[PDB]
Amino acid sequence: ANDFVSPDSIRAQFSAAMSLMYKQEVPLYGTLLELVSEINQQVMAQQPEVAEALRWTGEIERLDQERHGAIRVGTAEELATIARLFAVMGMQPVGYYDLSSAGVPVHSTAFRAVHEQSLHVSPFRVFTSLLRLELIDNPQLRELAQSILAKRQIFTSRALELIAQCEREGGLDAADAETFVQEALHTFRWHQDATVTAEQYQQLHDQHRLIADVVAFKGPHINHLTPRTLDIDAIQLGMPAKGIPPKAVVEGPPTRRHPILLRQTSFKALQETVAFSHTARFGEIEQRGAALTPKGRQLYDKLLDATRVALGGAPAEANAERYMALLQANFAEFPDDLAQMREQGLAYFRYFATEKGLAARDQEGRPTTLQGLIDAGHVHFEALVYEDFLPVSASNANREAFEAALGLQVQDELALYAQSERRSLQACAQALNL
Ligand code: NI
């Protein structure tokens, strides 16, 4: 057909280049990566069921490089153009996260690949927030922010050319893809020289730290780059030793044998200077578990809400031991047995033909049902890994405004997970001659 490289390959290259750039900017991220590699190796050696799970699903091959980035943009035009940038790399907008409820003036989506085979090549995602200026109730401050943002140009001209070329021609060859990665990366580099005076920076920063982080800098620098660990409890035990003491409160469900959604915590990664005069860069670590169905999401939200009620306040470091204890107690009601998670329809799964099943594929007399094939060892299942982010604690005007700015509708992650599960069952049926 042509000599264009796969968008998935460009995404893997971009993720790797972002990681190297960020490590140069933020040395403690490199320290974290060394700790993640050690923890993940220990889990695989000590927990054969985890090793097997990751082999069945192919995640063992993607795990070591698996990351997400987080960025913030300031204008609708920036969001729409960044969607085009990410589309070069096979990344589509999935989900919608509105923090206007929680008092933070942003709403967001995550750009990611959508199909398990693409995700296998690279599961890189970029959580992308758009600052909302209407929620600023000091008119002169809103005007200042709008004027500063209006005239900045966060994309290099060469990046924009290669985005347009990709769209018109249907892809990029290896040399143009390499140029694209380098040009795109410039958008996300740290720049110490602010675009505002110290006075302006002060007024923006007291309105909300996030407003200054967006408006005062030349572009959308990396807010964090998060590697994936197989055991966030283990990494937390190793992180004080390395000078990145994390928040004791871990976001997400408590420890489980069969994790759900994700768990995450944060740490201070670097004190930076801003020139017109200091600002912190924070890091993050995450552990990714099973994607939940609508039913599972409803149960999750209910138990998390009950934990917060029992806490009597806001989860903070001062109450961390008590919070974590209440979280475990309340989440006892979420089944922690994979068979029940499947039978009760709480999580999405992938199904695989086993060696035993394949060897029996020409037999009559085999079990006539999916459960019967599982029971006889012909089909094996594992949870489908969650690719998205924790929901905002909980009509459509905000999502509609976001989608108008984005230039398309966000994809429904639950529909995408259902499709992954279905494709696995179809592939298993073909492999087993059913
Ligand atoms: Ni994050």
Residue numbers in the entry: 3 to 278, 287 to 404, 422 to 461
Pull text from the paper:
In this step, 2OA is converted to D-2-hydroxyglutarate (2HG) in a reaction catalyzed by the Fe(II)-dependent DUF1338 family enzyme hydroxyglutarate synthase (HglS). Homologs of this enzyme are broadly distributed across multiple domains of life, including nearly every sequenced plant genome. Conversion of 2OA directly to D-2HG requires two discrete chemical steps, a decarboxylation and hydroxylation, making the chemical mechanism of the enzyme puzzling. We further show that despite very low sequence identity, plant homologs also catalyze the conversion of 2OA to 2HG and adopt the same structural fold as the bacterial enzyme, suggesting that DUF1338 family proteins catalyze the last unknown step of plant lysine catabolism.
